[PDB]
Amino acid sequence: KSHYICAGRLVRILRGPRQDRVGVIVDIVDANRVLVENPEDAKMWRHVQNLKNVEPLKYCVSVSRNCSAKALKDALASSKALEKYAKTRTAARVEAKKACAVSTDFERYQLRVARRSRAHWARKVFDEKDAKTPVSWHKVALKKMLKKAAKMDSTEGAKRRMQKAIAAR
């Protein structure tokens, strides 16, 4: 179910100078505008936001329309919505995007070796497992031909060709 636009609903700003910041709806003007405010964010004083620029979140604090600044702060702290939000995956991704944006050439190198190291060990684990139960194209095809090859290579004529041409090496 989608999260409704209501008083106390937490939102994330989509675009603009407040992009990726979290606020509380506090009040609804009309079908197009709300009055977002977040006490814990410095740039998130009470202001008007277009509803096309907000993304409702799964958290709604219990405040009335046009609630006092103190009441919103107490409700925000008591509900622990910000603490709960910070533990989600999307919140972590937003922090990750900011880290990459301000990253240096050295940190970009560190991420490159970290991803390459994980890629190398994923292959090591995958190949070890593929040896036991074949799942890739080469191991499944090899299993598909081992039974036929063993039957055909066990003939007396094949064994004569085995040694007569191995010895030449």
Binding site: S2, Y4, I5, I28, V29, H47, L51, R65
Partner: protein
Amino acid sequence: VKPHLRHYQVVGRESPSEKNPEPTVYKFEVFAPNFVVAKSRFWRMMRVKNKVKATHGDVLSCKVVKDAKLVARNYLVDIAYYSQRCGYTRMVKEFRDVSKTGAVSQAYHDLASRHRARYHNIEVLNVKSIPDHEVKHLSIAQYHAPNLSFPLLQRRTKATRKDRAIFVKKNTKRAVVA
């Protein structure tokens, strides 16, 4: 977006002379894009009401009336406009906005779209904030519900300008041409 009209207060009078050594001082409320348009609207009002021309008068003050704190309110805008077919048409409309200037600016857009009225054919008689219990229109009164909630449907969410792309892989977010 911020309102395109500002709240101006123009104070002016007929220039004193022998016939009128102590002229009356008039205070005028007007919503204009700039103070030059505000002064122009003031002298038009003076000419058609007090029979005083700009060439025979002076302006005492043309300051901007500051908006109050932004609060979701109901604004009752008394507005009128002229058309050739019907002369002068005066209406009273209710708006939801956070300031007097925003309500009046939204009123000008409303008159421009529903009645094809431009700025210079429109007079704003009065604008004021009114309580929820004096709102008559249901389209405005529906926003006073103590528990008003609605989902966001049929929404076109555009990416950030830096991250917009022309071709994107069908079920992913990887940009192919950007």
